[PDB]
Amino acid sequence: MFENITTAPADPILGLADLLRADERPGKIDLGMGVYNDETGKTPVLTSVKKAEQYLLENETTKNYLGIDGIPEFGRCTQELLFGKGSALINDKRARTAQTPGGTGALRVAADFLAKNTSVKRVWVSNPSWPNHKSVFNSAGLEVREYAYYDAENHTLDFDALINSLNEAQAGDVVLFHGCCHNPTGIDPTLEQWQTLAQLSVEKGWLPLFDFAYQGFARGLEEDAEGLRAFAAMHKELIVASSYSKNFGLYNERVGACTLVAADSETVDRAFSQMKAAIRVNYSSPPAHGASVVATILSNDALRAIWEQELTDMRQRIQRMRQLFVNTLQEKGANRDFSFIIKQNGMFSFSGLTKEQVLRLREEFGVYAVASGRVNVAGMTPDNMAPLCEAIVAVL
Amino acid sequence: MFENITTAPADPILGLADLLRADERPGKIDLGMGVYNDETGKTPVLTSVKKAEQYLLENETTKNYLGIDGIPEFGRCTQELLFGKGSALINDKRARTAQTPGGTGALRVAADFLAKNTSVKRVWVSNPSWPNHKSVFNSAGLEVREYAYYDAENHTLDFDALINSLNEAQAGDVVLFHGCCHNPTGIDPTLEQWQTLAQLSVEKGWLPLFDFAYQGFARGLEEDAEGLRAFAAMHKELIVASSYSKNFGLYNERVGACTLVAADSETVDRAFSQMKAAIRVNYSSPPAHGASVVATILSNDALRAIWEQELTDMRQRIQRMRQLFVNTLQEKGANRDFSFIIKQNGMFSFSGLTKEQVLRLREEFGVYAVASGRVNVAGMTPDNMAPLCEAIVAVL
Ligand SMILES: *Cc1c(COP(=O)(O)O)cnc(C)c1O
Ligand SMILES: *Cc1c(COP(=O)(O)O)cnc(C)c1O
């Protein structure tokens, strides 16, 4: 049965991990997968998280199955984080949230739900975008189209090409938007552009689907949700796939959420029943530990205060490396100006390096980045900055 | 977009949970979902598990993503549990294991993998079987056929109808087998019958797929794997979807595994690469906490000793309730003989009650069981046995 199966192509992001643990050459620098590192180059467990785990160990009395949609409190805290404490969406009970296994899990559940319960056939994604986006929607049987987004020449958001590109999007098509910290460009729309998009969306009849995996890494928790809230104010329906992997440093516990919004509570309830059916035939019910930690933290004023500060520390350290990176490149005799990197938010940065330059950095210097030229600034430390910049200068 | 979505039908098993927490009538008795309860009617965290969680809290230094296939040690301990310490399958490196989110997750991953990488089009399942089996395979686009299994009249395994029924299975079809503790009948094939099936399987060219969610609940860890090992000895290829939800009482942490076996290491490696591709487009990587606990326990002689005993205690308490159940029914003036229930293993028992009798038990007595007449013996306690049996006698 398995004789003729072909070897699957390596994942553009996850595949780097395999190359790393196969490279003896010490001094390696990992700027691939989007994981936060502190000044030491380690990815520690947040203190707020350890304290929540301590709490769960002392108070958990059973591991009995959670409902298909997960921990209710988790869903509530998630909705408040997304739409705001006194949001009308919450008061009118127009939103239902299912706890899922990571942000990827949320996107997959949204995909399956749409494919077998709606007339949706096309999903529009930005060019460029997280590579797994196309793969997930295609796996559900949905076709993916791309819309212009990044201006490679000016290293900015080409809003005119975006709008014009989307005119090709028909009513009933899904349009995916990154909530903030666009992966891989790091370029997000301004508040006015979001408002223009929200308006256009309603008029063209698109179904907005937000991928929110970096809330808190651009400017702040509330500020980072302004774009989504602009859409939520004019739309009757939308879908939000969120992730807590990065802002809680809970990567391997797979904590995410898929939020569904409809015109009213009776409609979202009916729709949600079909979303739960899609979960039952996938993994049945979500993993408790990770989500339990997030709910415990967000619902406790003491722990939430600590967590919010740790999040602020992470954002500020990336902003510092982003600065040290640009200065060191210049200081090390960089060819061109990389000041544009200062205007990008999040862990990433589209460096502008070609595939060959990325390959050479890996082959000759032990510097690992994604073939697209995407680099994880969060993987930069005051200690590896020098050799990293020297390697980059050598390939320019 | 969501205006015309229809309400999904309630899950035959999970739906009971909703009815329970909507029923004021105190004294309710839950014999539905397959969850273990102790003499108190509670589902506690195993002591071995709490100790492992204590260990993880003190020693975990990062929550960084696990590989797509999960924790390597977990995979190793799983293979040893399934095939045996000195198994040839392990020595020849013919098996690859992916850590998944529960046993359901393992079945879904196996389904997706088969649908897009093989010529498989049909999956044969026993009549009756866990209801979610048909739903999971159908969701992957595979058709499901049923083969005779249970003799409703004699309350035994009709081996002749099974064999004859399977002659309709073509080479290249998948045939699903419950490793032990058949859900819902509790009737498993004898070792000689397994051997006859293994032989027939090889000859007809079927691809065996074992659902192993109750290892340790029939006779013991090793004894419960005799059937699978009989197949593993004659087959070049097979798939095993296992679950640790029940034997570790880790239901809500979603810990399972999907093991793939091929003729040789180069073939299983190629095949496995495609299985990982299927995981990447679903939930990306598995939840660490649950599996970490299982690996910590199984790899530590001290903790494994405690866990094995707790497992033995669970099996023995169900065997006692199975006895007290039959005796009390007789003692309470039961109509017919339920001695056949003593010959069934696992948490369940196909009681023989009709759908109406099950509905009446729920409506008039607050006793909840699955419409098929399946009852969770593990939910019976010395305290609820009397009222439970009185209710059953009243509907006979
Ligand atoms: C990290 C990320 C996700 C989801 O990741 P999970 O690890 O599954 O939580 C989704 N979209 C983008 C753009 C991401 O960066
Ligand atoms: C419990 C069970 C499963 C899988 O359950 P998970 O909770 O997803 O681990 C699969 N098959 C049968 C027959 C089961 O009883």
Swiss-Prot record, chains A, B:
Its cofactor is pyridoxal 5'-phosphate. Keywords: Aminotransferase, Cytoplasm, Pyridoxal phosphate, Transferase. The keyword Transferase applies. One of its GO terms (cellular component) is cytosol. Changing R374 to F/Y: Second-order rate constants are reduced by >5 orders of magnitude. Changing R280V: Reduces first-order rate constant over 25000-fold. Has been used to construct a 2,4,6-trinitrotoluene (TNT) biosensor strain. Changing H133A: Slight increase in maximum velocity of the overall transamination reaction between aspartate and 2-oxoglutarate. The modification N6-(pyridoxal phosphate)lysine is found at K246. Induction: Transcription is increased specifically in response to 2,4,6-trinitrotoluene (TNT) and its indicator compounds 1,3-DNB, 2,4-DNT, and 2,6-DNT. Its EC number is 2.6.1.1. GO terms for biological process: L-phenylalanine biosynthetic process; L-phenylalanine biosynthetic process from chorismate via phenylpyruvate. It catalyses: L-aspartate + 2-oxoglutarate = oxaloacetate + L-glutamate. Gene3D superfamilies: Aspartate Aminotransferase, domain 1 (3.90.1150.10), Type I PLP-dependent aspartate aminotransferase-like (Major domain) (3.40.640.10). It is found in: Cytoplasm. SUPFAM superfamilies: PLP-dependent transferases. Homodimer. PANTHER family: ASPARTATE AMINOTRANSFERASE (PTHR11879), ASPARTATE AMINOTRANSFERASE, MITOCHONDRIAL (PTHR11879:SF22). Belongs to the class-I pyridoxal-phosphate-dependent aminotransferase family. This is Aspartate aminotransferase. It comes from Escherichia coli (strain K12). The lineage of its organism: Bacteria, Pseudomonadati, Pseudomonadota, Gammaproteobacteria, Enterobacterales. The gene is aspC.
